[PDB]
Amino acid sequence: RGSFVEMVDNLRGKSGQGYYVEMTVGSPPQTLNILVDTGSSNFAVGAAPHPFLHRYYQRQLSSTYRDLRKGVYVPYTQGKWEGELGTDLVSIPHGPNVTVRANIAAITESDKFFINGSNWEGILGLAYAEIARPDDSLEPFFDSLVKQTHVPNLFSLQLCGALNQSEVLASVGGSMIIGGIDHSLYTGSLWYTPIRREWYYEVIIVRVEINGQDLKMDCKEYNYDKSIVDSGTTNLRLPKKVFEAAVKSIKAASSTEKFPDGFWLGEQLVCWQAGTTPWNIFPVISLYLMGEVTNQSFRITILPQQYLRPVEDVATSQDDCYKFAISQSSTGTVMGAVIMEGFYVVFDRARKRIGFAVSACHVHDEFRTAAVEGPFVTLDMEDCGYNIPQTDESRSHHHH
Numbered sequence: 202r203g204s205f206v207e208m209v210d211n212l213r214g215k216s217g218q219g220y221y222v223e224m225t226v227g228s229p230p231q232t233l234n235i236l237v238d239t240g241s242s243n244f245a246v247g248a249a250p251h252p253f254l255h256r257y258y259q260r261q262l263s264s265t266y267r268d269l270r271k272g273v274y275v276p277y278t279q280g281k282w283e284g285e286l287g288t289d290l291v292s293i294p295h296g297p298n299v300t301v302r303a304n305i306a307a308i309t310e311s312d313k314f315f316i317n318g319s320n321w322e323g324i325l326g327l328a329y330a331e332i333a334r335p336d337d338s339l340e341p342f343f344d345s346l347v348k349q350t351h352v353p354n355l356f357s358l359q360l361c362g363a364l365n366q367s368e369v370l371a372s373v374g375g376s377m378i379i380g381g382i383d384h385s386l387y388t389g390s391l392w393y394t395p396i397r398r399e400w401y402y403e404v405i406i407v408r409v410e411i412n413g414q415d416l417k418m419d420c421k422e423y424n425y426d427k428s429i430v431d432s433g434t435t436n437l438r439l440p441k442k443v444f445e446a447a448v449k450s451i452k453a454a455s456s457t458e459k460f461p462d463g464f465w466l467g468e469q470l471v472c473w474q475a476g477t478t479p480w481n482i483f484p485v486i487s488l489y490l491m492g493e494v495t496n497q498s499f500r501i502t503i504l505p506q507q508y509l510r511p512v513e514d515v516a517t518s519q520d521d522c523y524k525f526a527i528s529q530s531s532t533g534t535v536m537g538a539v540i541m542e543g544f545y546v547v548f549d550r551a552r553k554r555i556g557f558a559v560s561a562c563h564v565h566d567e568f569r570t571a572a573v574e575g576p577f578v579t580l581d582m583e584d585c586g587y588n589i590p591q592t593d594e595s596r597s598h599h600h601h
């Protein structure tokens with residue numbers, strides 16, 4: 202292999218509203234646009250009319266649909282989705298030339314799940330069974346794909362971030378390569394960090410720098426209470442203490458400009474006149490990730506072109522306006538699109554590792570580029586992993 206032409210450019214989306222892939226469900230195939238989400242583990246599709254859906258999965262139209270006679274209820278921070286579990290035939294038209302029988306959660310009711318204008322009608326959870334709902338016995342899509350076909354246990358993502366239009370958000374594109382690595386999608390070295398545990402795609406950050414300046418924190422703070430690689434999150438999200446330190450450093454480096462507090466909170470845009478954005482006043486951010494070798498790390502470095510998100514405003518379309526896309530977390534580090542848009546990211550499930558290489562499509566300028574660099578060696582490395590306190594709820598679970 203080394204080339205997967207038919208799968209290149211199979212992702213679409215609107216800036217800040219997630220990347221989706223075309224999928225078909227049922228016999229005959231019903232086409233739906235599905236959010237590619239490495240931060241969840243259910244395949245769930247709209248299956249009833251909704252204000253924001255132009256279309257939905259029609260179970261009755263599918264000769265191959267089977268009801269599992271079990272419901273599912275998924276609450277979260279922003280809202281909830283719920284529905285009926287079943288199985289049906291699933292394919293990815295611009296993916297591998299295979300059809301599989303997968304679990305599908307047919308979403309019958311939801312609150313603040315679907316997004317007006319996003320153009321997606323469902324979610325493809327690509328993480329592991331451990332975080333599937335209602336429980337880990339509901340096989341995720343990718344597990345079924347690998348078990349039922351000869352597709353190698355690996356996928357890779359090239360998310361290409363963003364203007365033509367003032368009335369709508371900017372269109373984005375990218376590639377999901379299932380079963381391999383496409384060498385046309387990256388340049389330079391591909392560096393791997395271990396998947397610490399197979400639930401989320403959990404990784405370990407050992408060091409953080411802002412414009413070459415070490416944040417000098419106990420490295421467990423970087424992974425408190427976890428660090429994950431998540432295509433279903435827009436922002437780089439950082440643990441409270443890390444967020445505060447990072448913002449302070451970025452503020453100081455960019456101090457020639459005085460932005461409102463709303464900007465640093467991601468609640469307000471800042472603008473410059475077309476093409477005059479002073480990129481050079483904003484620092485690079487480096488995350489050092491644990492290497493496959495003990496005592497080694499490598500760094501991924503992103504630019505303000507990644508963490509400042511373009512939003513073309515109607516009232517001031519002569520200007521280039523940006524949202525600050527680094528935000529606070531209380532559930533650990535989330536390396537979302539802000540990180541992933543810099544890189545070609547290889548989810549090597551077979552070898553329990555995640556690969557990063559400089560993306561052939563990343564946004565940069567003539568002075569700086571997103572980078573992937575290593576090795577960095579450290580004498581006698583402290584364990585940077587955090588151990589989440591075990592609740593009685595969690596401890597009570599039997600795993601046969």
Ligand SMILES: NC1=N[C@@]2(CO1)c1cc(-c3cncc(Cl)c3)ccc1O[C@H]1COCC[C@@H]12
Binds near residue numbers: 219220433
């Ligand atoms: N990983 C991740 N997936 C989550 C939350 O975190 C998600 C994301 C979006 C979503 C909305 N707008 C833009 C993007 Cl990139 C994603 C919309 C719904 C949505 O549902 C959440 C359901 O619970 C699992 C995690 C899901």
Ligand code: NI
Binds near residue numbers: 599601
């Ligand atoms: Ni038991």
